[PDB]
């Protein structure tokens, strides 16, 4: 159904190599806006190189529907954006694949066993 973009609270941040701003959007008819569709429109507005520099988050639709508003954050380069941004925000976008770590309870059970053995402890890694 399309939407109308109009940013707010812009703050050029050269220390962090990024631009931060709230987006505000108007969409009569349509139910919400996906971030894959929003990142394409905010790219062509701001004359960006690459979608991977841009990262987007928040987005509540208000009560009633039609209106919505959220946050956004245009870096320069994707490699700077990968460094300073935490990984969970990038992942929703899909730029970076999720990292499969082991569980928190399982990790704790290693180190309490690792306390008990002095010397060479590394047999406990394969054993658990």
């Amino acid at each position: 159904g399309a939407f109308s973009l109009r940013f707010r609270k812009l703050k050029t941040n050269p220390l962090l190599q990024r631009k931060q701003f709230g987006v505000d959007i108007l969409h009569p008819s349509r139910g919400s806006v996906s971030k894959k569709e929003l990142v394409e429109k905010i790219a062509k507005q701001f004359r960006v190189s690459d979608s991977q520099s841009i990262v987007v988050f928040g987005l509540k639709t208000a009560f009633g529907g039609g209106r919505s508003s959220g946050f956004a954050m245009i870096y320069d380069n994707p490699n700077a954006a990968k460094k300073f941004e935490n990984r969970f925000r990038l992942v929703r976008l899909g730029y970076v694949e999720a990292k499969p770590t082991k569980g928190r309870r399982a990790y704790k059970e290693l180190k309490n066993r690792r306390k008990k053995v002095r010397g060479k402890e590394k047999a406990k890694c394969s054993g658990a």
Partner: protein, 178 residues
């Protein structure tokens, strides 16, 4: 543990059973189309905040710097809310308020006053079933209370059958069925 304030919007009266009281409350239900006696006691309580504020201020002195500040802030609310008319700005006038002044300002009446709803009861059902755009965005709640610049603004929501949208669901069942 959690740092969240909370309060009670109403409180019950001391006498449970008085025929003087129960008759006059039942009129306010019948006029303005209310669910239960809590909705009256809410506004009974809400007035007594504003009334006890003015009662504290009015005892002092007209040149006192507390009264000239806190009075003018209180009078701005009553002009904004459409509760006292702007021709009289005296603090004394706030005392002469009644519950009927508050209950004419809520959105049940201001739909009906507008006349789209037709009947007091119908107006409550139109509010709760996601019609009636107040300003920019639609409003679901009878006990809204309108701020006088906003009152001209109430209109059917853009979405919905009165508004000019998909005709709900039951009209489609008749239309596609035929």
């Amino acid at each position: 543990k959690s740092y969240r304030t909370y309060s009670k919007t109403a409180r019950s009266p001391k006498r449970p059973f008085e025929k003087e009281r129960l008759d006059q409350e039942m009129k306010l239900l019948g006029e303005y189309g209310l669910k239960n006696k809590r909705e009256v006691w809410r506004v009974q309580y809400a007035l007594a905040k504003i009334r006890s504020a003015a009662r504290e201020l009015l005892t002092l002195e007209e040149k006192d710097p507390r009264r000239v500040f806190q009075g003018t802030a209180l009078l701005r609310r009553m002009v904004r809310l459409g509760l006292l008319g702007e021709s009289e700005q005296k603090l004394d006038y706030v005392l002469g308020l009644t519950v009927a002044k508050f209950l004419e300002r809520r959105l049940q009446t201001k739909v009906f006053k507008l006349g789209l709803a037709k009947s007091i009861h119908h107006a409550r059902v139109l509010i709760r079933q996601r019609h009636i755009r107040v300003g920019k965005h639609i409003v679901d709640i009878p006990s809204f209370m309108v701020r006088v610049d906003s009152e001209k603004h109430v209109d059917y929501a853009i979405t919905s059958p009165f508004g000019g949208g998909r005709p709900g669901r039951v009209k489609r069942r008749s239309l596609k069925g035929g």
